[PDB]
Design a protein around this ligand. Structure first.
Ligand SMILES: C[As](C)(=O)[O-]
Ligand SMILES: [Fe+3]
Ligand SMILES: [Fe+3]
Ligand SMILES: [Zn+2]
Length: 298
């Protein structure tokens, strides 16, 4: 099973640090943004230290990398035309960076209507994707299932299907399924994950599911809040999350944790990934996981 987490793509080491971080958590896959997750400021390809990173990955059993576009990209914006056009330009460049890094999937929050309404937002996202995609690219944009917080589009499978249907080179589109987002959007992944996966297959198609984000949620089903929670400490729970991670239909899909760092105070936060990955591999919930992370225990 391919299980990992988001890791930082930063500093002078860039991809090498990302791989070192992933290996330190016992991950065999990882997800990175191509720079700061909250902005479009980026380094050149040469500065990404890709060959050092890939050599380290090979030496540590890391077989697949996923890339995520900055969360500020908004090709659903119909109000600020610079936001839209800059998003389009950035994504074209991001696909080239992703191809250079050797990842096949570039995760993208579809877009947000920011007040123009879902219908308008969906039309705009289709326009943006049609301006971005080339027939030659060897990367797929994995549209992420969203929680529906704010003005997010992509809260339902039908919204994603509508976008996909409007894109010419839609063979370049895939989907990233996030457990916190789908639960928050209203899908019953706690009691009927198979039903949600079947609904996904019927509306979008499992052939397009290329990345999984494994997160518990701080809120009830349908809350539309998007506040991730450590594995088994939220409203989704260990049993459901573990079931998804080991699902017979999702064996070849990378599973990426994006759970919150652990710590009572803001100035002392530690990654939970090593412990969460081991817990999921053991298939046994550990009620003292947060205690252990907040002390350095195993
Ligand atoms: C798009 As996210 C990092 O809230 O799963
Ligand atoms: Fe995301
Ligand atoms: Fe996510
Ligand atoms: Zn989220």
């Amino acid at each position: 099973l391919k299980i990992g987490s988001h890791v930082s793509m930063s500093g002078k080491k860039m991809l090498l640090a990302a791989s070192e971080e992933a290996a330190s958590y016992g991950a065999n896959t990882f997800m990175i943004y191509t720079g700061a997750p909250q902005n479009t400021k980026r380094k050149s390809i040469e500065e990404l230290n890709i060959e050092a990173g890939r050599q380290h990955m090979q030496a540590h059993g890391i077989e697949e990398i996923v890339v995520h576009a900055p969360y500020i990209i908004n090709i659903g914006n119909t109000t600020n035309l610079d936001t839209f056009s800059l998003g389009v330009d950035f994504l074209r460049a991001e696909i080239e960076r992703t191809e250079a890094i050797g990842a096949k999937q570039l995760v993208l929050h579809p877009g947000a209507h920011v007040g123009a309404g879902v219908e308008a937002g969906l039309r705009q996202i289709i326009r943006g994707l049609n301006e971005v995609l080339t027939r030659e690219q060897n990367v797929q944009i994995a549209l992420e299932t969203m929680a529906g917080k704010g003005s997010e589009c992509g809260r339902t499978f039908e919204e994603l299907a509508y976008i996909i249907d409007g894109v010419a080179y839609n063979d370049k589109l895939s989907v990233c399924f996030d457990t916190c987002h789908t639960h928050d959007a209203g899908y019953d992944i706690v009691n009927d994950f198979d039903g949600v996966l079947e609904e996904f297959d019927r509306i979008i198609g499992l052939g397009r599911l290329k990345v999984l984000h494994i997160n518990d949620s701080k809120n009830p089903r349908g809350s539309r809040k998007d506040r991730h929670e450590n594995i088994g400490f939220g409203h989704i729970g260990f049993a459901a999350l573990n079931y998804i991670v080991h699902h017979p239909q999702l064996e070849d899909i990378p599973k990426i944790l994006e759970t919150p760092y652990v710590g009572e105070d803001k100035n002392n936060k530690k990654p939970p990934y090593k412990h969460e990955i081991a817990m999921l591999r053991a298939q046994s919930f550990d009620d003292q996981l947060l205690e252990k992370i907040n002390a350095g225990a195993e």
